[PDB]
C-alpha cells in the first residue's frame, strides 16, 4: 500500500491518508511512501517515513523545498494523525517445525489482532510431494478449520506437509503464517512409482544454450524412502547433456532438439520429455 | 519376546541405536518513554517525583513482561480440551441442552 | 554402524533424526582478506603554500 | 559529475556503503595397504625385504 501525507502549518499536524483520500482543511500534500517499504519491512514504520518526507520541504512554505537550516526538522512539536486503513498485526506466529510420531494429535494456534472486526480464518495444506499446491482444509469435515485453532487427530504419513492460515477482514487486509509438520513412521512403505516437477513435459525451455534446467523427483507413496538416483544418457547427447547431483538433475541444451531422458533408482524409472527451442 | 538374552558364545546378537531432536526460539524488543520540562520538576511540591516516576516505569515493564510470557505460554499448549460437546472455539456456547 | 554420512547434499548422519540436523557444518577462520590502498604519484610532486 | 561536494551548511549530503564476500574449501581422505606372511619373510633369499 501507498500512503499520502498532508501537512497543516498552523496546527503542526501531519495527516496520513490512503492514495485516494484527501482533505480540505488547508493542508498541503508533501509526498507519498510505501508503508511495508518492501526492503526492510520490520526495520521502519510510519514515523520514519513521515520524518523523511518532511525533511525536504521548507518551514516557511511547506509547498516549496529548502536546504538544511530551512527544513522542518523538529518532530517534537509535530503530531502525526492516522486516517488510513489499519494494518493487521501478528501477535503470535505458528512454530516453524512441529515433530510428531504417527497416531498422535497436533494443534496449531495463531493470534491476530487489529484491523476491523470480525476476523475470518482459512487454513490451507500443502503436501511434501513435488508439484503439490495449497488446497483448502474442508470446513465441514474439520470444524476447527474455520477457527484460529486447528486440531488434527490421528496423523499419518500423508498428514505430513506445510500448513498455512489466512486472516481476512471486512476491509480486506490479509496476513498469513506457515508451519511445517514432520511425521516419522516405524516401517516405511515400499516405493511404487516416481513422479517429477517442473514438468516432465518440456522441462524449462530456454533458447540460450548456457541456461541449465533444474529437475526434482519424489515418490508418490507417502513416507516412502527414495534411493540415490542415477541417470541413463540417451541417444542425442548433442541435443542436450544431463548431469545428476544427488536427487537434483540439471540439463544443458547444446542443440535445439527434443530429447528424452530416463532416471532410475535401480527399480523404477522416470520418463521425462525435454523440449529445446532456438 | 523382545528380552535381550546372551548365550555362552556371545557374538552379534543385540544392537541398538539413538536419536536426538532440536528446538529453537527467538527474541523480540520492547520499550517506552516519557518527557518532562524543568519547571515541572523544580516548582512541584513533591520533592521526590523522579523516584516515583522511575519506580512506576519499572513496575509497568515487569508487568508487561509477565503478561507477554503468560500469553506465549497459552499460545503454545500441547493439548487443548473443550468442555461439553463443543468441538471448536466457535462451537463453545453457554446456552442449550449442554452448556460448555 | 553410526555413520557421519554427509549433512550437505541432503544426506543425514545416522544419530540425527528426521527433525534434527547438525548445528556446526563448517569452521569460520575469523581472519579477513583485505586489500591494500592504492599508490599515489601526483601528490608527492606538489609543493604546499600556506593559506 | 559524481564528486563529494559540500556547502557551508552541510547536512545529509553524501552517503556510502560497503559489502563483503565469502569463500570455502573442503577435505578428503586417502589410503592404501599391503599384506604378507611370516614364511615369506623367514625363508626368503633376500634379507631386509621389509
From Swiss-Prot, chain D:
Portion held of the full protein: 102 to 151 of 401
Listed transmembrane segments: none
Subcellular location: Virion
Protein name in UniProt: Major capsid protein
Its job: Assembles, to form an icosahedral capsid with a T=9 symmetry, about 60 nm in diameter, and consisting of 535 capsid proteins.
Annotated organism of origin: Enterobacteria phage N4 (Bacteriophage N4)
Domain of life: Viruses
Amino acid at each position: 500500500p501507498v500512503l499520502k501525507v498532508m501537512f497543516h502549518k498552523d496546527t503542526n499536524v501531519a495527516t496520513v491518508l490512503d492514495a485516494s483520500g484527501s482533505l480540505s482543511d488547508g493542508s498541503v500534500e508533501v509526498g507519498t511512501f510505501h508503508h511495508p517499504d518492501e526492503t526492510y519491512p520490520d526495520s521502519v514504520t510510519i514515523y520514519h517515513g513521515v520524518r523523511d518526507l518532511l525533511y525536504k520541504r521548507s518551514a516557511k512554505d511547506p509547498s516549496q523545498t529548502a536546504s538544511y537550516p530551512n527544513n522542518i526538522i523538529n518532530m517534537q512539536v509535530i503530531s502525526i494523525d492516522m486516517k488510513a486503513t489499519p494494518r493487521l498485526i501478528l501477535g503470535t506466529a505458528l512454530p516453524r517445525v512441529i515433530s510428531t510420531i504417527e497416531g498422535k494429535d497436533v494443534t496449531w494456534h495463531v493470534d491476530v489482532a487489529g484491523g476491523k472486526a470480525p476476523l475470518t480464518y482459512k487454513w490451507q495444506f500443502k503436501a511434501n510431494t513435488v508439484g503439490a499446491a495449497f488446497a483448502d482444509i474442508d470446513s465441514g469435515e474439520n470444524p476447527t478449520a474455520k477457527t484460529a485453532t486447528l486440531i488434527n487427530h490421528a496423523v499419518t504419513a500423508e498428514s505430513a506437509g506445510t500448513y498455512k492460515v489466512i486472516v481476512t477482514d471486512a476491509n480486506g487486509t490479509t496476513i498469513e503464517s506457515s508451519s511445517l509438520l514432520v511425521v516419522g513412521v516405524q516401517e516405511p512403505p515400499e516405493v511404487a512409482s516416481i513422479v517429477a516437477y517442473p514438468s516432465p513435459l518440456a522441462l524449462s525451455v530456454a533458447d540460450d544454450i548456457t541456461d541449465g534446467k533444474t529437475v526434482k523427483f519424489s515418490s508418490l507413496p507417502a513416507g516412502s524412502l527414495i534411493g540415490t538416483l542415477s541417470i541413463k544418457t540417451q541417444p542425442d547427447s548433442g541435443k542436450a547433456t544431463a548431469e545428476i547431483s544427488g536427487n537434483v538433475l540439471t540439463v544443458k541444451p547444446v542443440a535445439a532438439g527434443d530429447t528424452t531422458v530416463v532416471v532410475t533408482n535401480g527399480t523404477k524409472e522416470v520418463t521425462v520429455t525435454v523440449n529445446v527451442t532456438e | 519376546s523382545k528380552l535381550p538374552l546372551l548365550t555362552e558364545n556371545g557374538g552379534r546378537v543385540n544392537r541398538v541405536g539413538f536419536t536426538r531432536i532440536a528446538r529453537e526460539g527467538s527474541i523480540h524488543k520492547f520499550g517506552f518513554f516519557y518527557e518532562f520540562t524543568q519547571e515541572s520538576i523544580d516548582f512541584d511540591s513533591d520533592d521526590g517525583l523522579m523516584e516515583h516516576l522511575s519506580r512506576e516505569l519499572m513496575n509497568g515493564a515487569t508487568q508487561i513482561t509477565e503478561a507477554v510470557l503468560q500469553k506465549d505460554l497459552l499460545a503454545a499448549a500441547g493439548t487443548v480440551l473443550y468442555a461439553g460437546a463443543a468441538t471448536s472455539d466457535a462451537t463453545i456456547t453457554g446456552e442449550g441442552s449442554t452448556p460448555s | 554402524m553410526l555413520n557421519y554420512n554427509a549433512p550437505t547434499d541432503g544426506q543425514k548422519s545416522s544419530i540425527d533424526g528426521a527433525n534434527s540436523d547438525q548445528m556446526q557444518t563448517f569452521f569460520w577462520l575469523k581472519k579477513a582478506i583485505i586489500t591494500a590502498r592504492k599508490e599515489q604519484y601526483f601528490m608527492p610532486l606538489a609543493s604546499v603554500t600556506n593559506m
